[model samples]
Target chain A: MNLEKINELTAQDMAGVNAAILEQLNSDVQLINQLGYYIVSGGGKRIRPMIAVLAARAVGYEGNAHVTIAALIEFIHTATLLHDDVVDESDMRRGKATANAAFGNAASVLVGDFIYTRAFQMMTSLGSLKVLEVMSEAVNVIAEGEVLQLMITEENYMRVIYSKTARLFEAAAQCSGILAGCTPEEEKGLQDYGRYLGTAFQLIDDLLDYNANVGDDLNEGKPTLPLLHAMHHGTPEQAQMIRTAIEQGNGRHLLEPVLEAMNACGSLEWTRQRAEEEADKAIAALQVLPDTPWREALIGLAHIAV
Target chain B: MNLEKINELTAQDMAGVNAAILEQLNSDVQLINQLGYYIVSGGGKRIRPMIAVLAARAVGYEGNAHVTIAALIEFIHTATLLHDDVVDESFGNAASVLVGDFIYTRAFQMMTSLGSLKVLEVMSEAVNVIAEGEVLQLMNVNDPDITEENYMRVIYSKTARLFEAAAQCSGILAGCTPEEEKGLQDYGRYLGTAFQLIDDLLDYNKNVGDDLNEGKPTLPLLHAMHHGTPEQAQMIRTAIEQGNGRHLLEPVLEAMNACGSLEWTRQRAEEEADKAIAALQVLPDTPWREALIGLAHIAVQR
Candidate 1:
């Protein structure tokens, strides 16, 4: 189940999800409609919502509530990115001007709340307290993880990524399960699947900062896994160079040297290995469920993310 | 039913509400705890919570859910205040933005605990409107084309809608009749709009034109802008367009006074308060109802 096949299989459902997204984003307020459309229609792969759709379909669910679930999950993710841009003071995301940049920070902030609460309203529409209970806790934890990111050891790094990224993915699948009436084991399996896939996704994201030579992670002095690995294993002089870069930041000048150190220490490959392991673990988690095309799509999503 | 009397009447209930506010603001994140304390303890009147409590009791609610309703209502308000500071781009506002999200979702969790889909629907929709209002207000900034009609729309979204929800949710929790609920909802909206109008007016007198300084096209500024002579209108337009109008405070005051802009604003607040009081006539004639009326009277007086 390559991405092309997955897209073809879930094409109609994702169309519903996309249409639901655009419909839900409409407001009497024009800025909301404009900015909301800009961000949701930005060139994202829609992987998270795809997980929602696939997970629901994997459970042999025949209901259309999964469309709402998929759309709202995407809304929560979109809203988070809006505020995340503001907090990071980012001018661009995904090779386009960020909403906070194109519109003002004030527009981004307020409209972010609009989308966030709109997601809550959709959650309420689902008429499932258990969904509310899970989604609310999921969002609060994501916020807490954001705060935690500001302040982490490598182990702390893992926890932070899980909180900020994987937890929502975890909820994306777990809540879909709850809505689709998955059994206890099926629910846990899907939850594990999302958690592992999301973690792998973020791992690759951090690795790409080095691989693509954007050096944003190094520039921000983010202690991502690759940076930490290179720092811990490089020679003493190289370790001190990376340590100072991490501490003083503005390390874009050091990108080549950092890349060299990461290369020498196999940090990039190790991180990729870590991500691939997670993808495999994710596919393994799906073993508890019946083998089906949607399940294969879920496994393929984890692989493509890595 | 005056301010002092209302305070005396709801003192115990307000205490419970205050405790709930602090308790709910609790988080393991130190920044969330610190900023949440700083804002919740900041000396704003607990008027929203007070309205929530009074509306609940006014409709004969005897259960403790009113306390949760009151507390979560304040949380919604508090969270907005935090985000407003960030939207204004105040110092240390990154903390404000995140903590605001923290409090916002925490409020949602609290609403879920209530298990009243009716209350949840009201609270959720109210917040959505409040957010929309904020965006409208942001759009209004420095746009001299903003009409008084649009200004009222902005204020209703940013300020009064939450007030409407605070009281309406209480009525819902109390299981009040539809008429009583609508009446209380109208009362809250009117009172909130009045409070904000008075707030805008009071800002002119006390701060001598912070809104003007920020280029906020609030009612008074818009009024003076619309009513002054063409030359004076041009000056106010430039002021709104460029901001930093404090340099023109004396002349601006003269323009507003000659145009009776502040007077016009004061009358608008009074009219809203009158409507607010009239809305309470639909409620049962209890002390709580009188307290609601008292809030309107005091709102205009302030």
Candidate 2:
């Protein structure tokens, strides 16, 4: 399958989906319209929508309903992002100032509600009660997952972080598959693939935090895998130093030694390796699909992690 | 009409409706289940649901769907209350600690989605597009309208609130005279009248913050007759004052003494009283029906 052809298809799908998102987000409430547009239009790789479009195309869904579904998925994701930024109290996201930081929490929340309700209105128009049931449950579970992640972050549990964060990506992908009329068995496979891919994606992200980027999730004493590995492998004093740095909420004092330990243990490489394995599983699940651009793109996504 | 008969009717209606509310609020998620139950169980007057129930009974419809309608109305009202408390950052509500405060903003937002969707589902069953259209209109307008025209629009807006609920109640009421159906309409109108009256009544609640109490209670501010008396009307100004002292109440009471603000309010209350009176004009002149009129009397009689 040609990668260029797939990119062309994705671009076409995204153009329509983006327009739908803008239209649905239009509100008479000036603050809501302004802040909602800002948060949504703020630059981030519309990856969840991309997955939805790809999943639909992979299953040969030709109608424009998939475009609506993709846009709705993105709205749901955007709403969550707005709420999460407030809950995390973070000033930065995707290397830009967070919406909550600029617009205020009240605006973020109300706009989030607007988007959430608007999405429901759109979904109901699809006229599938199953879609409503599935989306509602998905949203409820996502909230529970966020609460679980909050508990994990408070307790510094790395596994819980992966489960909550990655599992959502999996659910999003699986939902797209279901919407596209995939067989139940096939839907489950795609869901599993999404779950693993999402986990791998987060794993790579964790590696980057320790190796190349300085970010809050790590800098604010988060016990991500790279740090966890260093703690397990490092000497007693080294482990104690890492623990103290996390507890102190300042990584500056221990940054160098922590980087040195991570490098020595080849933790970044190990994380990459784990990601690759998961990517392989994700790719393998798509083997039943006929030769298609989306299939190849899925394979490219696995390599995109590296 | 005998009051006991009316009381028995309302009691029977509420019991079934409350059970339906619990059933609709059920969720597979444990926290949702717990919080939803806690909220429904939390003491609310259940005024909206009661309107649906009473309206159905007044119509002489004899079916159980009113129970579901009543539950749905209460759900929508409760959902709004959750969001409103969060928006206002209110700490005190119905003398209970608000759950919205603990859940952060997410609880209000998430529950709104649930309630809105559930309402949509219920409305779709009836295939009526007008109900949502009316709600959308209400969401657009938020102004002080103590007028006949605006008041009718407000009444129409509220009809959708209880219409779908009341219609569902009518589905339960199961068969009635055309006049009895008119009585149901009358019931909704009178209930909304009493409801808004009670809202106006609570403004005078002495136990609440004086600022809110005074802001709401001053009938002189609402009426044109007292507009001519500058000294007595200055009492309106003092009442409008934020953080006014208890001494301000003396002036307000004195103004009421001289200008008959209380009597003026009572006079306006009589308008609703007459509407409720005229509403019963078409219904079968039964004793139990007379109690409906008595209930409206009790609403604004204070």
Candidate 3:
């Protein structure tokens, strides 16, 4: 099926999840309501929640708990993004000013608290102790990963992306198996799928930032995978140039040389290849399930990692 | 029942709570570990956990969960202080907001380990309420007309909710009857209110409306506002609206002293302290109980 059908197929389920998120975002605090809606309406692909819905169905879930889980997941995601923007001092995201930029850092921080505690309340409402444990652990790991990302080095960059980015996806898919009453074995399969997909997604994101158009993770000196790979693998002169760029954080001027270094050493291709490999592993994790459209959708989505 | 005696009374219990805190602060990440230990051991009087242990024994609790509960209570309080410091840009310490998140989520993790859904419910709500209180204070900042009642709501929400939850949870864990739990909750409220009231008074050192320097229209400042002469009131109001009172500090303190505003505030705190003692009057006769009574009294007196 085409991607349009993929959107159409989950429209009804996605609608329920969206409504749950909006309902939870409702608050008496004006800033919370404003920032909550602003961030929610900022047009994320909703792929995380969409994956939750699809994974629940692929595992034969009949209840609507996954819908709630999806919304809870998004709230957790949005809450982190709010704080992340404040920490990053980022001005724009997704073609719009971030909540920290649009509102103030103070409001952004407090509303992040509001959204997070609200997420906790919603998590408690689900009456699943395991889900609560899994999700809460994910929340803490995400925070840890964020801080680690700030102080990242060549030594720990992959761990940063995995914990900061992939852990939530792992939790989303793992708990969907729980909601579906899948066995622990099957749950691990789904968990691995989500984890690999998330790793691929983030890998591609860091890979694509090399063209110097994606908000200067390069120029801003994020120490992302592409830069790290090139420097470690490139020649001495190339490594020195990249190192100076990183030191000054004025590296976009040297994008061509960096790109040349990256391409010559196959760092960019190697990163893309790693992402595609992750996508394959993500698809292979779904072998426990028979051929079904929901499963197929998960496959197609994972393919985007390539 | 002297303060030193109260310290001796709860020393063993507090030691265990402090040890747990030390153990929990252990983390692989240097930043997490650094901020965690820095905030945890900052040496504020461990009143929250002390009250938790004392309240537990007050209700005949014999188990060790109160130890964990007390540490978690302090954790929750410290977490809010971290966030509040960040909001005020009061870098009394470093990484105010991020460290706050570490503590807050760490408290949640520890709360989950306690295996009590009710504990999770109450404490999570308390966290949310405290955040609301922080935001409310920000809203009321520089608003000279902020009512005493509004200030009351903010303080209770921001400061007392954790105390209330801690005491109430101790009661729940100790298997206290609902009425007894009500009494513990009241005990916590009175004690917490008195503590915050005295904190405001401390900020109102003669010739210095220090809280007003931060634009906080705390009860003492509001009391002076109601009782000051028209000129004094306008001056105070202007200082508040600007959140800068260094120039007017002496005159504001004069207005406060003339009206006995700080005295009135302390008198109110003393009343709450008396009531706090009254709530614990029914607990079985024990040295810890008397020490708790002493704790409440000196909480205002000191």
Candidate 4:
């Protein structure tokens, strides 16, 4: 479905989900209430929650629990973002000042906690012990993944980055599948789809860092695919320059040369192709689903880069 | 019972409680685990947890859930201490160095969440909710009070603090009456008893700065008795010179001499002692319980 068509189909559900998120984010703590609302209201695709609602509806889940779950997934995601901003000391996110930038670190940290606990409280109300176990395990794994990502950032390990970032999407999608009571194989397929889709997304994001009007990931000294591939194919001097930029996190003069090396090695196309392949795998995994608008959308999303 | 006798009676129970606290504090996060253990094992009296246990036992609770409850209480208390030290910007806590000082804040915040969620997970788990209620109330009334509204807030606030308060004396009494509850209430009677006691004890702690030493308020400021003359009040003012009295503490020392604030403090303690004694009238009169009664007097004695 086209973006407009998708919006038209899901607008009512999305609106309800959005309202629920705002209500959930409300708090007596002044800073918490303010920042929570600020972050939640910050415009994003609401992709995960939307997927949840879609999956639940696709499975014929008639109850409002799906709406609650959708809001919850968003809360979990937002809480992680708050904590991530603090860890990264990031000033900007989604073209706006991060929650940590807007709220002080202590408030951000405490409010992140409030959101997490509040999510758990909501989870318990579902009266499903399995849900609690799954969600708790998901949170713990996400935290582990965050710590792992921190380590990767420190070490500049490409493989670990891929695993941590991509695996989370896999987990999120898998959770949606599980909530729908999909068969184990079906759940695994959806998870793999999410995992590969996430990898593709990150790879594209990394590419955008280079290609987008804004400064590329290489400029920020984030070791994206282009830089890593350049390191492999470029001359010794070229590799060394890239390494210095990565280590120092800023080498303004080296940016053009780095982009040149990336072009010479054709690393940019290689990264794009890799993303396309992963997306293709994701599409293949979803083949079990019948031909529906969502199925077609999933396929289209996987091939967006191509 | 005497403090020594009470300690002896509850030593084993307290030891079990301490072990659980140690375990709870354990984590794989290197600094958090090491510092968490260090701070918890630091030689503060486990008074809070001890109260939880004794209270549970006093109420004829044969189960070991109280052990967990007591440990949870200490966790909450320790977590607060971690955050409080950072908020106060004090260097008194030794373990604060390893954990970024805010580690306690993170730990307690996480622990309270865990404990509260665990209670919700288990339908009968009341400790977590009680602690949450207590903390919420404490945050609600941070400023001190001598008024009836403040006093009532303090009294009813026992829903959580009483876990520790009652536990402290319950083991000896074994199922206290309304009178016993009254005595326990007296132990926590003051709106700022724990905070005040800490304020009072800091005077003796060379490492810690008292209200006068730190320029924070203590009971003497609120209730000046005969010893505190106008001039002495000024010196006390210098001591509590806006939470920054490290240098002017000597002036407070001099003022304490002229105004006999310490003695006046003793008289105030005597009044609290009488209130505690009067509340004990319904108890099945025994020496061990009376020792609890005397303990109130001892709190003010020094």
Candidate 5:
């Protein structure tokens, strides 16, 4: 199954997830509703919720709990997106003005909080201790991941990426498995699948920052794997140049030279190869589940990440 | 159970709550601990947690779950304060935002530990309202036309809702009578409103026109806006609509004084305090109840 076919298989369930997200985003505060709708409707890929719906179906979940799980998981992701915009002082995202830019940073932050706690309320409605425990810890770890990324000084990049990006993905799939009453072994398999896929997704994002966005992260001085590769493997002069670029930002002017170094050092290709490895591992992790179209979609999602 | 007596009475329980707070602040991530410790240790009255302790005791319960409730309640407030600092920046915006989230999720973790679905429900809904209120207040800021009702709604959502949840969650944990729970809830609501009124009122005298400087349309400013002379009202309106009104402090203070805005705000706070006291009459007479009453009385005095 490809992306569109995955959506086809999960269309009915995703509709419920979207409906649940909109209903739960409702608040007496008009700014919240306005900003909430703006950010949620901001044209996200909905990949996380798709994985959730598909994973629950693969585990044979017959009830409506998976819809709430999928919706709240997306709510969690949306809240983080809003906060990230403020932290990054981002003016644009997904090709439009960010919520912070459109609604102001204050609205973005507080509405983010509103959405976050609403997710918690939804989690409570699930009536599962394990779900609550997994989700609360997942969110906290995600925050820690963000802080670790903020405090990054070139060490434990993998750890930071796992915490910041992959932990939520793991929790998304693992919690769905829990809701569907999957066994411990199967749950671990699903967890591994998500962790690898999410890591692969983030790796591609880092690679694309150089190959496609071409100096966006360089401008922000993000030390992603590709940058680290080029910084270490490029010629001595190129390495020194990239070092200065990383140390003192506003390096979009150096995009040509940086891409020169990245191309010469095969940094983007190396990053792509690592992402492919992760995607392969993600697919390998899903073998424990029974064969189904949803399972195939999960495999396809991992492939698409690369 | 006056101020001294209340603190003396709940000293042991409050100590445990503080310990829980410090323990939960723990994280392997260095910045989370650093900023978390900084904000929680900042000197502020622990009145919210005190209410949790007293309400639980006043309801005649015997368990340590109230300590968790009190600690987690304070965590929620601290998280909001940290986020408020980020929204409102210093102590590093990134640190404040991320650490605030750490504390927030930590609170949810603590809430889950209690294993009371009802308590979780109440606390979650309370936090949602608090967030909504913050957003509402964000909209209300710099708008001079907002009424006293709008002002009240903002305060109840941003400030009192957490206080209400602190008490109501304790009542839930204690399994208090529905009447007693409502009484505690009302008491918390009133006390928190009065406390915030005094806080906003103090911004004029103690902070010497901080609200005017920020263009915050609190009760004093709103009262003066409606009652001041035409020139004074227009001046206040311009000041609020376009902030950086520190230079207008002298005229603003004169207008507030001329209109007796401070006096009107004090009266409103006093009335809320009385209502808070009255709400406590539903609970049994005990030292804890007396402490709760004393808290209400002390709220207006501050």
Candidate 6:
């Protein structure tokens, strides 16, 4: 899977998306101008916008509607990242000081508001009631998902990922499909594809947190699947170690031992296998699209997800 | 001129607005429900909603659009207050920041239901300006060099922008003439300015230099800094930067009293309320109109 090939496929569209995003971020407030642009230009993969554009193309969208929609989708994502850094009290993201760190939490939160509302203003101008309805509901669920990740996790952390990370991707595809005049069947297919791809993406993300030495999820006592599995499947002593780390939110004391348990039990492998299965299903959802390189790129995205 | 009379005049409409607001606030998230209602219980002033109702009626709107708009405007206001608490780092209200997120999105969801592109456009712009105001205020905090022009600009964006939108939107829903909409917009701007000025003045009544501890350089402090003696100006500036003025209370009050700084602030508020009332004179005579005028006077009463 060549990432460069995928970029070349929608090279012009991607440029349009970036231009639209900059236009939206235009503001006289120096802090807003700085922080908003910083978050967008930061090392995000732009996966959401790509999914939005590809989904639009998969359904035969010819006009520039997808450009603004894709850009606004990224705006919503960027806004969340800004606030997420503040709520997570994160100092670094993508190996750099977060907007909240460089700009202060005050600027981050307010500028986050500025970006979120600007996306909303863009939503009203989209002139499609169905699109507006779908988009607004998407953001509300995304926010609710954030709160849910904080407080809710009876057992399955999958629900957390679905709400927090997957819903916007789902909406991004679903609404764009609607705009591109996809049939109901095609819309549902795109929605499911997005949902599955997002699930796999977050699963890989959760795994990477452990692979990386500075796993903030572990430090925050977050109920990720890797941690959840270590508790349920590890030996009693190992389980106790996981429990202590979780309860104290100090994984440094038991990280190596916990990783040993996760390794011995093949828990990380199991999570990755789960991601691959979801990604496979996501690729299967593209059956509704014709045989085009655009569709193939989406399939390639799922293949790379694992 | 009675407050109850104003409430009675818009009694039925207010009921609908409150109900719509309640329905949206009935979110499934426990924290949203808890903190949202807590903030509601915090400030029961229905002044902004009342102005929305009166402004709509002032232009002879007879539908429920104004009611929904009123509720949403309050939601927007409530949302900002929640965020402001966090931005100010008002400790003990840590839950406010998240609750603010809940309410902010809640208002966005409600705006979708109104089904008016015009409403959505106005509200999105209004919120953006209000947020810009908050960021500007954050920058201006403890910075005594904020000019009168800068201060008023902040006040307009932070406080008056929402009010202007609320009233102006009601006029839009009322199908008023373009001239009428502009009048109502100006009316709300003036009224909101007066309302916030009095809020600043009331702080001084409770304690001399009360806002000094908070490092809030409101109209009173700005006026005092201009009129007070050089030593008094130095004291206020130091207290502002250091956020320690408990001991400066006596002398600060003495300086303000001698300089009539509070009086000067009250006069500014009164002048704003007068302008608010003057804007409403464009419409024909009606009891609701009179009640609206009466509201302007009552706004600056304290």
Question: What TM-score, computed on C-alpha atoms, does each candidate reach?
Answer: 0.95, 0.70, 0.93, 0.67, 0.94, 0.92
Residue-by-residue lDDT tens digits, candidate 5, B1-302: 56889889998998888778778877676665665466456666689899999999999989888998999888888889988886532166677787778789889999999998998888988998888888888888789998777889989988888888888889989999999999999999998899898888788765577778777799888888799899999999999998889899889888989988988888989999899889889999999998999888888774
Q: List the candidate 2 regions with Cα displacement exceeding 4 Å.
A: A1-6, A94-96, A148-164, A211-214, A241-257, B1-37, B48-82, B85-201, B204-301
Ranking by lDDT: 1, 5, 6, 3, 2, 4
lDDT string for model 5 (A178-221, tens) is: 99999888899999999999999999988888756344888876
Superposition error at B206 for model 3 (Å): 13
lDDT of 2 by residue, A47-101 (tens): 6777777877778777778788778878877877876666666677766787767
The lDDT values for all models are 0.88, 0.59, 0.81, 0.57, 0.86, 0.81
Give the distance in Å from residue A159's predicted Cα in candidate 6 to where it truly belongs.
1.5
Off by over 4 Å in 6: A152-155, A247-250, B35-43, B87-94, B206-210
Q: Which candidate achieves the best TM-score against the true structure?
A: 1
The digit string of per-residue lDDT tens for model 1 on A1-306 reads 898998899999999999999998678778899999899887688989999999999999999999999999999999999898999888989788999889878788889999999999998888888989999999989987777666535897788799888899999999998899999999999999999999999999999988542668888787889998999999888898878877775566788888889999999999999999989989999998899999989988888888
Pairs clashing within candidate 2: B1-B287, B61-B173, B61-B174, B62-B172, B62-B173, B62-B174, B63-B172, B63-B173, B64-B172, B66-B169
Query: DockQ score for model 2, please?
Result: 0.13
**Top lDDT prediction, candidate number:** 1
Greater lDDT among 3 and 5 belongs to 5
lDDT of 4 at B113: 38
Query: What proportion of the real contacts between chains A and B does each prediction keep?
Result: 0.70, 0.01, 0.38, 0.02, 0.76, 0.51
lDDT of 1 by residue, B1-302 (tens): 77888988998898788777778767676776775577556666679999999999999998878988888887888789888887534335587788788889889999999888888788889899898888888877788988778999988988898889999999999899999999999999999999999998887875668888888888988998889988889999999899888898888888999999999999999999999999999988988889899888888884
Candidate order (DockQ) = 1, 5, 6, 3, 2, 4
**Error at A247, model 2, angstroms:** 6.7
